[PDB]
Design a protein around this ligand. Structure first.
Ligand SMILES: CC(=O)N[C@@H]1[C@@H](O)[C@H](O[C@@H]2O[C@H](CO)[C@H](O)[C@H](O[C@@H]3O[C@H](CO)[C@@H](O[C@@H]4O[C@H](CO)[C@H](O)[C@H](O[C@@H]5O[C@H](CO)[C@@H](O[C@@H]6O[C@H](CO)[C@H](O)[C@H](O)[C@H]6O)[C@H](O)[C@H]5NC(C)=O)[C@H]4O)[C@H](O)[C@H]3NC(C)=O)[C@H]2O)[C@@H](CO)O[C@H]1O
Length: 145
């Protein structure tokens, strides 16, 4: 590791932890782990304000359902917005993955196993994000910065 916040090593799922200094343009956050085989049909990574879960700037939510698709959304003052759905599944049940979020001024760039998968254009100010959560059908090796 060569970043500036110590990695969360082998974090238990569900996980919620502080992002030191908050999201910043240029910050890269990696979630590295394995999708579980028979422990649910969904997982999510949430970039959120505090630990309540009612204000999530970016919810990245693969669903092994209806062919496999990924939901991208924002929750503000407790309410979900209109979902962006990509109708391709880049993960696989039982399989290891490397999931990398690069914060840019206009969007998150989301890379799955070294391929840019989606760009989520910010709906709310990313500076207000100070917490990352991961939940659902995954086990994690690390979350790094
Ligand atoms: C004229 C007419 O009659 N028209 C109707 C339409 O109105 C109707 O359309 C449907 O209308 C309903 C409302 O009535 C709704 O809008 C339907 O849309 C669906 O809405 C659901 C619920 O919001 C969507 O599912 C949710 O999606 C969001 C992202 O957008 C999240 O993925 C939600 O997942 C939850 O996420 C939480 C945070 O990560 C998580 O909680 C965490 O869990 C952790 C443990 O793992 C830990 O506990 C932590 O503390 C906690 O915060 C939850 O576990 C997680 N829940 C689940 C179940 O995973 C997700 O629930 C859904 O995607 C959306 N679908 C669509 C298509 O938009 C809308 O379809 C239609 C159809 O009925 O009929 C017409 O006739």
């Amino acid at each position: 590791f060569s970043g500036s916040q110590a990695p969360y090593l082998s974090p238990a799922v569900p996980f919620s932890g502080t992002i030191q200094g908050g999201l910043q343009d240029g910050l890269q956050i990696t979630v590295n782990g394995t999708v579980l085989s028979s422990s649910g049909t969904r997982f999510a990574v949430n970039f959120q304000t505090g630990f309540s879960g009612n204000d999530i700037a970016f919810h990245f939510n693969p669903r092994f359902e209806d062919g496999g698709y990924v939901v991208c959304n924002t929750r503000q003052n407790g309410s979900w917005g209109p979902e962006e759905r990509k109708t391709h599944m880049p993960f696989q049940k039982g399989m290891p993955f490397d999931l990398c979020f690069l914060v840019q001024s206009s969007d998150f760039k989301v890379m799955v196993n070294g391929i840019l998968f989606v760009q989520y254009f910010h709906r709310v100010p990313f500076h207000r994000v100070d917490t990352i959560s991961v939940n659902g059908s995954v086990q994690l090796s690390y979350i790094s910065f």
